[PDB]
From Swiss-Prot:
Known partners and oligomeric status: Monomeric.
Binding site for nitrite: H64
Intracellular or extracellular location(s): Cytoplasm, Sarcoplasm
Reaction(s) catalysed by this chain's protein: Fe(III)-heme b-[protein] + nitric oxide + H2O = Fe(II)-heme b-[protein] + nitrite + 2 H(+); H2O2 + AH2 = A + 2 H2O
Primary localization class, coarse: cytoplasm
Protein name: Myoglobin
Protein's GO biological process: removal of superoxide radicals
One of the record's GO molecular function terms: oxygen carrier activity
Protein residues bound to heme b: H93
Assigned GO CC terms: extracellular exosome; sarcoplasm
Known function: Monomeric heme protein which primary function is to store oxygen and facilitate its diffusion within muscle tissues. Reversibly binds oxygen through a pentacoordinated heme iron and enables its timely and efficient release as needed during periods of heightened demand. Depending on the oxidative conditions of tissues and cells, and in addition to its ability to bind oxygen, it also has a nitrite reductase activity whereby it regulates the production of bioactive nitric oxide.
Lineage, broadest ranks: Eukaryota, Metazoa, Chordata, Craniata, Vertebrata
Positions of modified residues (Phosphoserine): S3
């Protein structure tokens, strides 16, 4: 459970992200796909991309990055009260897309890295720790739903 102070740090940097959702989504997905190529293979839409330049030139990738970060921002703004948001997400990611929990850890790392690069003054160690806690809480709650579903 995050304290109110920790949530404030999370949502303060997130409000900076929402000034350029699409650019953040690109940076995050590209970092993820380069650092963990097994994640790219899960996307029929994107697995044809073979270079960073190709990834940066893909409008469809940019569109999906907006979808991902919009869903994540809606989760974070619930400050842990996100049960309704996680239900369809866990269902599709466990049973249709077949995404291991570990891959959620990978994208969490990419998120933290991009936020540190783009917002250093609002992403010192205090905010890094709080964002890590928020993304861990998300993963914990998704993992419990995965376990229910046998995945």
């Amino acid at each position: 459970v995050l304290s109110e102070g920790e949530w404030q740090l999370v949502l303060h940097v997130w409000a900076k992200v929402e000034a350029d959702v699409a650019g953040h989504g690109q940076d995050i997905l590209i970092r993820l796909f380069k650092s963990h190529p097994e994640t790219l293979e899960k996307f029929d839409r994107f697995k044809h991309l073979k270079t960073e330049a190709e990834m940066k030139a893909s409008e469809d990738l940019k569109k999906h990055g907006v979808t991902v970060l919009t869903a994540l921002g809606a989760i974070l703004k619930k400050k842990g009260h996100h049960e309704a948001e996680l239900k369809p997400l866990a269902q599709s990611h466990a049973t249709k897309h077949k995404i291991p929990i570990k891959y959620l850890e990978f994208i969490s790392e990419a998120i933290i890295h991009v936020l540190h690069s783009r917002h250093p003054g609002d992403f010192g160690a205090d905010a890094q720790g709080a964002m890590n806690k928020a993304l861990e809480l998300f993963r914990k709650d998704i993992a419990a739903k995965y376990k229910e579903l046998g995945y």
